[PDB]
Ligand binder design. Structure first.
Ligand code: ATP
Ligand code: ATP
Ligand code: MG
Ligand code: MG
Lengths: 355, 314, 355, 54
């Protein structure tokens, strides 16, 4: 039933973020526009292995998010953990919708290392509106062990929220750039979301996803190496990462830190080259085009130049908030730009919510 | 005013369509084949008309709609549900099993509200009515009471006869409900039904023009009895290796000497289609003859009636 | 039951427009003739993702349209959103009309990524009156998820209107030129309708549609890029587009603006070359002929010359209103010509309504 | 069709023997012998009930 819902970053692991866009009126005209945004560092013990495992504490945190937001809306879209979802493509024959859903569940049954006991939702990589009966089916299945979804629904229920869409982050992060992707439509673009628990790669022709792949490595790895090499707590190692790696006065600390994070840098580069090579299936004689970055782990200083020179692709930060109207009297464009990578998904399923 | 078709004749034709469609033949070619293999004209004639609508591009459900007196609303909706969901093959298999259960259930009340419902009320109380009516010929019979007793005591003494009537009922209900260590020795093997279905399916796909090996690969996926499925996988594996069809069959007890000898002619004659069609018709008629489901009715029918009458007299 | 109905531009997204043509008598002769026309900027939150999602507000807006029109008619033809309709061709065998409709629904079942739960309506790209039983069927299916149609019927119901035809814009826009197309009948013509939510391409031999293709890119993209690059609201960015790009005194602003819209220009051209190349299936050694433009996004200054030189086809604005009688004492031909591209469809299904 | 194969194969003996045994078994099995029973079965029953009714 129509409200403009809301959007949290429920699988932030490092941070629970939430965004309210609705249609803001100006001079008798209206359009999607940022209304509020809030961010709180996730209190751990909330999430373990991608499952919400202190539904109570997470509830209270989300309530703090709603209060800091000053939002009256109580409907929400959210996302599952990349560690909690299996995403992969699947080839079938299209037919009746029931026969597809059953046949889909039958093929993915092979694909799921758990009982069902499992969440199945598909979408077709090409418009069904393009092919004849019995021919040329392609769906991609998102499958999730059951009570990742439960845990999240409990969290949402006691926060006073009502969920309408439980989406996935690798595609929700794309809704902000889906327009700017939709304008070049034979161009192959990569989108990396380097988070704290996982790094997702999704590669597209236009805003048409060609594939996705999720890598266990993330910013938690950089923080954890910093912590190992200086017997620091996770928080002070995280700050040493953030402010340590990027200050103008940091000239003495990129040896001490960079020597700590160098293994992670090499090995992340190895994983990304890994996935990219594992895609290049059909065009044995071509090259790449252009790619963007999201998630706070991206904001590692100089990491964009490193990925650019190492993967042979131009890797650029992007401002999601360009998709939405921003009142300059309520929001500074500079800070908005600063927190854009963390918030990409956080506005992602948020354009999913007035949709 | 138009009537449907017989329970037998719906059966044969729904089975043979389910079989051809699950073989991956085009629906129109399935339709052509069963029409061209039919013995009654009214079936061959309809099925040409159903096929004529399917070649104009209509669904099978919408093509069968031209014969609503033959394929009822529940049948078409099952077809149309299969067509809408991409499961036409498995809903036709369901419909074939349905039609088979319907024909068997028909023969088997009638033998010795439709006709089955009206005949089954009518048989279940015939006797117990006889009974109440001999026991209503006046007063002072065998086992009664005088009418002046108090009603409750009169009714309780007769409880004997109320009981002999209910038992009579339970019996005729049982006959109508039933009636429509070497571990491997205990498994249900192939029956007459399962051989008749096999033979019809193969007679059907061969008469249509499919090779033997294409027909066997389809059939080995649509055989219901597990031991027969294991038999047929072995027959197909043997034939695909270059062994002669009659020789793969001769290894399995379910095929008589006559069946094998007849198939062995059909191999040398390029007439297997029809050898199988005549075998299948012979089996289908042997099946529908197979008669103890009606004699045992009558044993319990009059045997219970007579037990009641004896009961109170004594 | 015969009235001359009416016609709104219900999926204008930028503007709800409405037109009343009926037969105007002069000197004892009569003919189809413009009687009224009205236009109001669509209040947003009305339409989202092509669905009418504030049926109440849209109702009141349509009532304002009827009042500004001073029309007594209460029957209407309208159109669905291009984002709300799947249009594609489909090959079958013609037969009985029931067998065709069923077989059509059966084939498009494959074509629809939603339950049915879906609107199916076909028309034959060639006269059925040309081919024998079982042979040479071609229908094109318009399929629409169900309550786009509902939402629009609610809007129409509480506006006091009664719908008789729910048509599609890519073909409704053609009824104004269907005559002028019908006079050259082996000539291949392209028709672009650059709207605010979508750009449709339909290409024809005569007034016989050969195909259609809908592109997500539109004028909302140009406006949104202006807004991005000058942190403006959507309205002032839209005006900066309109008056900014076309004034005689605009000599200093096509650098500031054109540098903003240049990505959209390149990438639109890339989409149009894209679709055109995806058509050229059978004549590997031929060229194009002539093409027209409709929709207000077309009216971007110099955009016609740009599409002309870039696509290798003569792209020309066209005056729809030439199909209808226009009383010079009630309407200025100049202004009528000025608002012609926006109103093409708005008179389109409007010649559909006294038909 | 079977005889026509036998002509070209020099196996008419084998063909005819298997035809004959197929027929002999069809004969000894032998459907109108059961339908006409039932015609007279219920048809007579019903004739009685109608008989006294009237
Ligand atoms: N300036 C910076 N330099 C280096 N690392 C940073 C910087 N800012 C944030 N990070 C890292 O980014 C991570 C948080 O980013 P973000 O919130 O986008 O990830 P997330 O979406 O919460 O994680 P996930 O979705 O994978 O659970 C933290 O691990 C943090 O250490
Ligand atoms: N002179 C102009 N220069 C540039 N753009 C213009 C001009 N006039 C109108 N537009 C643009 O055209 C769009 C409106 O045109 P129109 O009303 O024909 O589209 P629409 O039919 O309402 O949209 P749709 O049918 O795609 O929902 C607006 O986005 C507006 O910004
Ligand atoms: Mg994240
Ligand atoms: Mg329009």
């Amino acid at each position: 039933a129509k409200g403009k819902l809301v959007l949290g970053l429920d699988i932030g692991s490092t941070s629970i973020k939430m965004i309210l866009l609705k249609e803001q009126r100006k001079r008798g005209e209206v359009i999607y526009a940022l209304q509020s945004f809030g961010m709180k560092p996730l209190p751990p013990e909330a999430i373990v292995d991608g499952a919400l495992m202190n539904s109570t504490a997470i509830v209270q945190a989300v309530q703090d998010l709603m209060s800091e937001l000053k939002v009256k809306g109580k409907d929400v879209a959210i996302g599952v953990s990349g560690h909690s979802v299996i995403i992969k493509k699947i080839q079938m024959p299209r037919m009746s919708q029931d026969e597809l859903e059953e046949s889909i569940q039958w093929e993915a049954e092979q694909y799921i290392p758990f009982d069902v006991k499992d969440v199945n939702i598909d979408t077709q990589i090409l418009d069904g509106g393009g092919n004849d009966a019995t021919g040329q089916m392609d769906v991609l299945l998102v499958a999730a062990k059951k009570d990742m979804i439960n845990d999240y629904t409990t969290v949402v229920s006691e926060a006073g929220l009502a969920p309408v869409v439980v989406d996935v982050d690798a595609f929700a992060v794309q809704n902000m750039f889906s327009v700017n992707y939709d304008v070049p439509e034979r161009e192959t673009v990569v989108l990396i979301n380097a988070g704290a628990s996982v790094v997702n790669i999704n590669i597209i022709s236009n805003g048409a996803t060609v594939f996705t792949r999720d890598v266990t490595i993330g910013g938690n790895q950089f923080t954890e190496e910093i912590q190992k090499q200086l017997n620091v707590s996770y928080e002070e190692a995280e700050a040493l990462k953030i402010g340590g790696n990027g200050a103008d006065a940091d000239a003495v600390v990129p040896q001490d830190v960079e020597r700590v994070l160098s293994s992670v840098a090499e090995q992340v580069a190895g994983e990304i080259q890994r996935s990219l090579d594992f895609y290049a299936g059909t065009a044995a004689d071509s090259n790449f085009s252009k790619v963007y970055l999201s998630g706070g782990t991206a904001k590692i200083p100089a990491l964009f130049k490193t990925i650019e020179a190492r993967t042979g692709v131009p890797v650029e930060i992007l401002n999601p908030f360009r998709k939405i109207e921003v009142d300059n009297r309520k929001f500074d464009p500079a800070f908005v730009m600063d927190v854009a990578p963390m918030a990409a998904v956080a506005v992602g399923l948020a354009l999913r919510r007035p949709g | 005013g138009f009537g449907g078709v017989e329970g037998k004749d719906i059966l044969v034709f729904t089975r043979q369509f389910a079989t051809m469609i699950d073989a991956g033949l085009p629906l129109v070619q399935c339709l052509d084949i069963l029409a061209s293999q039919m013995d009654n004209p009214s079936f061959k004639k309809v099925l040409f008309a159903i096929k004529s609508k399917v070649e104009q591009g209509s669904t099978f459900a919408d093509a069968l709609k031209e014969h609503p007196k033959v394929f009822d609303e529940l049948y078409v909706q099952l077809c149309a549900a299969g067509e809408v969901g991409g499961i036409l093959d498995a809903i036709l298999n369901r419909l074939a099993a349905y039609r088979e259960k319907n024909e068997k259930l028909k023969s088997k009340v009638k033998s010795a509200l439709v006709a089955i419902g009206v005949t089954a009320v009518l048989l279940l109380k015939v006797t117990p009515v006889f009974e109440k009516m001999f026991a209503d010929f006046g007063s002072e019979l065998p086992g009664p009471t005088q009418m002046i007793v108090n009603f409750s005591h009169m009714a309780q003494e007769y409880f004997f006869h109320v009981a002999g009537s209910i038992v009579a009922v339970v019996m005729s209900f049982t006959w109508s409900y039933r009636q429509p260590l070497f571990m491997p020795v205990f498994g249900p093997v192939l029956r007459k039904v399962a051989v008749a279905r096999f033979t019809r399916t193969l007679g059907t796909m061969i008469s249509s023009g499919v090779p033997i090996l294409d027909a066997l690969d389809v059939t080995a996926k649509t055989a219901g009895n597990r031991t027969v499925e294991d038999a047929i996988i072995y027959v197909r594996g043997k034939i695909a290796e270059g062994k002669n069809i009659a020789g793969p069959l001769a290894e399995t007890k379910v095929f008589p000497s006559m069946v094998v000898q007849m198939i062995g002619v059909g191999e040398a004659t390029g007439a297997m289609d029809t050898m199988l069609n005549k075998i299948a018709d012979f089996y289908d008629d042997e099946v529908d003859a197979a008669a103890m489901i009606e004699p045992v009715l009558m044993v319990f029918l009059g045997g219970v009636v007579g037990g009641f009458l004896i009961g109170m007299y004594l």
